[PDB]
């Protein structure tokens, strides 16, 4: 089935709409509105995502 | 707004929801299930996440 594309598909489309909440709440808080805005948010990102994504799975069970 | 907040909130929303996902493609697919899954599936996920969200970022400001 190919679990690489399977992972880039869904990657996708979550990253597309937040990529659109994401450019709204930096209209709506000009103040966070910086070059560098993206790259805080994605350190925030990688870290949090891979730890929840862990305990979400194993909470799964049931 | 708490930037932190706002950042750990949506990160968690997309971990969760992919979880789940990845959890119904292992039980559609039981071969993939492997001691190696949980972290190749969330770091190739995590890694294209960043990636497109970069591209949407740049094509939405731009438009």
């Given at each position: 089935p190919d679990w690489r594309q399977f992972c880039e598909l869904h990657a996708q489309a979550a990253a597309v709409?937040?990529?659109?909440?994401?450019?709204?709440?930096?209209?709506?808080?000009p103040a966070y509105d910086t070059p560098d805005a993206g790259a805080s948010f994605s350190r925030h990102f990688a870290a949090n995502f891979l730890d929840v994504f862990g305990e979400e799975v194993r909470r799964v069970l049931v």
């Open positions: 709409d937040f990529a659109h909440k994401f450019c709204r709440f930096l209209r709506d808080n």
